[PDB]
């Protein structure tokens, strides 16, 4: 099944934040309505916050996260969770190798803001 | 934050 | 129900990161083995990272997130999510007032690292 | 924070299923748009399905779960999770006593159907 | 990434319940320690319960859900959610066709029981 794709409420501010846990340099792209809105990159085996940014979900609300390592796409896992019917998290893990720890790039999207 | 009048008289 | 308390695997590194969305100054305390292991403080209405750190879960694996504004505990919501039976997120939202957006401090704990 | 309250997409069929794990008789009421739409009662320490029903979320999409034992409201915990941006679960646990297993009535709402 | 595989605490009872939303006959297999522990088969386009059972997680705690239709494995999505650090849900959706509603068989695993 498709992973890393989330439908947010339209034209809503959201945060996106990426963590690295791999010997490989991660590249995280965040697309909003199929346009590149953010790109984060870094290399850490200790959860460095290689990027954080406030974006807007736009007219469509479609947000997609893609992860790659030196051009090679990583396998993605994702889900969205809602607490007290109001606080939203969209979660992404990724695997760039063979150990299947799926933490090589971790991406957390949160909304509402403010 | 807080339990408030007028965005904050009460805290 | 208790919120903001998570049983992690014993003696294991985890990441903790906090974001702020409030006019009030947020104080986030992370307890391991019932003692404060990290404290983050900051103010933002635009989801600014007010702290990020890697900690060890201690002998018991018990991790507790406490959020307060000028010494008063905020109301917490929380959950843990596991993706592909391996990647763990422990998620906390908090409400410091009466609008119930529960984003006033948002805390993300993730493991494993590395 | 309020628990057991979920906003569903409007005019959408959904399933609700209640399980019992308690020495006390559980009563589960499901309200749609503030009106009782289903009610299940039963005692089990074996996860019996004390009721399952298909309902429509209606114009409001507002769905609330009430759990009580002999007329005393239980302490509810809840969250919503979405898989591959399309499959939804609204999850409820509840505690009627002192041991805090929060399984005494468990309620799962799922959509879409068909 | 692997889906439908969950690690439960060892020697622990859990509930498994399967719902159908498809014109095709669903067969749901539940494996414990890689051996078939329960099988449900049925058909419904109205979320009917095609099986519910109490199982034990055994020495290993490894539980795997498989779904097929007319002998063809369905694509799975899954996750685990923990509420108030105590109540566990392991959730599975499956897709037998092309509309990607991932509800064709829905499997809910919950623990602890009792
Ligand atoms: C340091 C390692 O880098 C990768 C592979 C090589 O090594 C990752 O897939 C592993 O999970 C681990 O983070
Ligand atoms: C059998 C017990 O019934 C209740 C209290 C009495 O006993 C529940 O709260 C417990 O969790 C347990 O299921
Ligand atoms: C009744 C239908 O049967 C399948 C395919 C054909 O039709 C399922 O995949 C659809 O989701 C839908 O439930
Ligand atoms: C205090 O109650 C108000 C406070 O700050 C506001 C700007 C808004 O973020 C609100 O959610 C927060 O509780
Ligand atoms: C919540 C708060 C903090 C400091 C001063 C005033 C108020 C209402
Ligand atoms: Ca890896
Ligand atoms: Ca890694
Ligand atoms: Ca608030
Ligand atoms: Ca706020
Ligand atoms: Ca109980
Ligand atoms: Ca119980
Ligand atoms: Ca389908
Ligand atoms: Ca279907």
UniProtKB/TrEMBL annotation, chains A, C, D, E:
<dbReference type="InterPro" id="IPR010907">
    <property type="entry name" value="Ca-mediated_lectin"/>
</dbReference>
<protein>
    <submittedName>
        <fullName>Fucose-binding lectin</fullName>
    </submittedName>
</protein>
<dbReference type="GO" id="GO:0030246">
    <property type="term" value="F:carbohydrate binding"/>
</dbReference>
<dbReference type="InterPro" id="IPR036684">
    <property type="entry name" value="Ca_lectin_sf"/>
</dbReference>
<dbReference type="InterPro" id="IPR016927">
    <property type="entry name" value="Lectin_sugar-bd"/>
</dbReference>
<dbReference type="Pfam" id="PF07472">
    <property type="entry name" value="PA-IIL"/>
</dbReference>
<keyword id="KW-0430">Lectin</keyword>
<feature type="domain" description="Calcium-mediated lectin">
    <location>
        <begin position="6"/>
        <end position="113"/>
    </location>
</feature>
